[PDB]
Amino acid sequence: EKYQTYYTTNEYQIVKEKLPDIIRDAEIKASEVLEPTIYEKRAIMEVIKDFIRDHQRKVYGGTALNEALKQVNPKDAIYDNYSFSDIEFYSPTPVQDLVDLCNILYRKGYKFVQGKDAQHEETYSIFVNFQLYCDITYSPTRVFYGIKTIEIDGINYTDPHFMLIDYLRMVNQPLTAAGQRWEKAFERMYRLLKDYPIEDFDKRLDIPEPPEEIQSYISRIKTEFLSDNKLNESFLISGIEAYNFYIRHAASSVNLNNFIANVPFSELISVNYREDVKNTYNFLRMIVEDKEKISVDEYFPLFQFTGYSTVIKYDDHPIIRIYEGDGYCIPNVKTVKTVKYVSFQYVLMILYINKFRAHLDKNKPMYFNYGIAISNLVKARNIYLDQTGKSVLDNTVFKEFRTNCTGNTISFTRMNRLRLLEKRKQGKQTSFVYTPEDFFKKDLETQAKLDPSKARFKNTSGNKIMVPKYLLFKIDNNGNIEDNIHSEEAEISEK
Amino acid sequence: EKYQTYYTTNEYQIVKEKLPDIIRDAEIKASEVLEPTIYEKRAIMEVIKDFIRDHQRKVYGGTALNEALKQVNPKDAIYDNYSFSDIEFYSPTPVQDLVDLCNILYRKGYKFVQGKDAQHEETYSIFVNFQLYCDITYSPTRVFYGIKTIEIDGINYTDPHFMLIDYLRMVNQPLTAAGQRWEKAFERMYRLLKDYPIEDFDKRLDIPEPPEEIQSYISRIKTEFLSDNKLNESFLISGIEAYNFYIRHAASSLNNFIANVPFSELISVNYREDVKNTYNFLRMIVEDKEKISVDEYFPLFQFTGYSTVIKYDDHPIIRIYEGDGYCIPNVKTVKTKYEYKYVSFQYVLMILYINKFRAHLDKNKPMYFNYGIAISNLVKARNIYLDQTGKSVLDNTVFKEFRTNCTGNTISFTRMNRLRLLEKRKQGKQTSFVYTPEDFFKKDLETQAKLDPSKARFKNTSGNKIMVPKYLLFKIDNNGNIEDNIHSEEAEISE
């Protein structure tokens, strides 16, 4: 039983070394002779880049980042001219844009030009000759025009400090996005925060201190409500409260506690919202001097950055704003006294999100405060690690890439396949396809049947829910709170 | 204006270092809490592993290589410390197996149990609770039982020296498979060829020397036919001719590895034209043309295309293989009459194994032993050459591996898949087949009776001589000449 040895030492090493270079050298050859070639690629991309310029849409994802990193330093590019990179962009009329770009590309000669309804969140896809070229994402009117942009070659590239939200959004989903995203999202976050650094503001935090009646209720929610172990299970401390937490923890070892801010109201995230809101309401309705002063404001999700929210107000004063974290496992910090705070990268995330809410809400003082808060929170973390000689991975309060989280989460695939099956049972139309070649082989009567204006999307405006049939909660005549048996409807593509 | 620096030197490095470990530590957490969890995975996996044992199917790929590597070393295993893998197995009745395993799993309680048409190499898919668990691949009866297996826990795992064919099949497709496969296929080829090395045979090559007339008809194909620059464009020299080429080249400053060439084995990247042309040349160069006979053969599973043997007095002169749609890595030579293309070193090492398997199916025991000797000798030859020259598998030698230089118009897998699907879509041969037992069992016994998995057609990939003329690619007209047969597609039934 004699045997031969194919591959040895260091022959195996020799192969592993040159192998990715050879694979590259081969992909180069493949791109210059296999259809679609690198030139067909370049051609379609410039056709789409022209359309974005024309309708003035907002480009995000890899394409915006690459373009932006390059405006600063071409060496900091995340793409090669061999990259078959997806050009993603935001649009308030996405299905109409899909039909236009699909027509334009078909007319230009290409095949097989196809416009599909993608798996992901209110995104549509354009494929040309079995190759995905771009993705059109629905952005509600309100959100859309509020997005800060940077201009390059007459194209609106989503502000680097806005794209940053989405990158933190990745690191802030440890169970559903650690494998598939944390490697690229860290690498990209690095270059983005290198070429577009976080600003340094010497300006003071000017958050108005509220009245004593309110000031006591905000405090008594922490001391009396959030202490009850059968009540605080699903709560996570966000807002200026959480901000101050990291601000205080930065003192533990030019220019002191001076970064501390007046807490204007509580901002909490619940991983069991409907139960936790009703419970906060009933607690305030018990601890409040004249219960008929209590009012409840609800808000739609802010784009794709938050879920629903509810503000409980006493004399039109916000006491607490509760956010819906249902379906998410939020990375959190543990201390817990004596005789749950959202993670450092989560607060750094919400601060940016809240700054954007302010911008949409037209609120200029809050828009300036969040910006100050971010700068201060970053100054705070840096000086702490400088004084302690620590790292973003050492078990500190400012630790990054946390796996430890609160809440029952579900993988993207699961979330996508379940949502699809729900709307499939509803008959809200599963997959939408547009093949201009096939569409134009059809009569003008059938061609007339297609209307992109008649397309519905989830209301993700961040706007106060006015109409009661869209409100999640109901206030009964006795003054109590109840789960509203409503219609979870949203909005048409008619702008 | 004055900015802050988030992430520095060597803070960026620090992150890149621990990051894949953290991602791993996170995937561990995700695997212990996200439905379906490993406590649902291993349940479904063991149900399928039981079915494979029952019907005695042949497991291949990653799962198979893993367990085989494991039976010799569990440290040299490919899938790591319960890294979720895909079940892939061969079956002569795959659609019936799909319906059985889909029923069994549904009855066992699970949802959503679904059996899809995978859209590949006559492969079918089983998903349970939005998670792909296994893939069933169609293997014709003839091929199926000829596959040498290794038994572990009453399950038939595909012989490592057979799986090797598929791994070489990957490195032998440089334009369509270099990016997506050459990294894993090399790593796996290494660990397979170390835990299951290539045998060492001291036995002599006993290939019978053919008649002086037959050898004369063979030689004149090389001189008078393959020299003509308007004829030899699509030809590639395979078989013992190519084998001998690498045997002679290993001995360049007892040359006993040389073999009698029993006949020419050629691969054409323009087969129908190149076959008719060989036939017509031989019909002119031959003494009495009525002694010329033509034997055709179906593709041998997924290892070859169609073949044609041109025989003079029932003696094989030349066997031509169909390489249409493939870009074969080669080594061009120039006798200066000039151009001669030999199939790459790893391509001959590949066909030798494929030919040894053909012999096994053809029951031919002397050829089954000769190919085995040839492989051993060809490997002995390459090793001793690199030992004498101090060279590597990547240096520009005749025995160079991972070649990019190839002959023939190829098309990317995606293109081949989407075009094949569109061709059968126009034919109405059914695009995507779905089985949802939950939905199927909500239906009446009359509709339930309509579903028959025995009535499923597959491409005839037996490697068998084409007997019936309506399945023959060529026709011999009364005048004695060759013609393209205007026949029907060879779709054998599952039964």
From Swiss-Prot, chain A:
Key word Amino-acid biosynthesis present: no
One of the protein's GO biological processes: mRNA processing
Catalytic activity entry: RNA(n) + ATP = RNA(n)-3'-adenine ribonucleotide + diphosphate
Domain of life assignment: Viruses
Main enzyme class: transferase
Keywords for this protein: ATP-binding, mRNA processing, Nucleotide-binding, Transcription, Transferase, Virion
EC number: 2.7.7.19
GO molecular-function term, one example from the UniProt record: poly(A) RNA polymerase activity
Protein's UniProt name: Putative poly(A) polymerase catalytic subunit
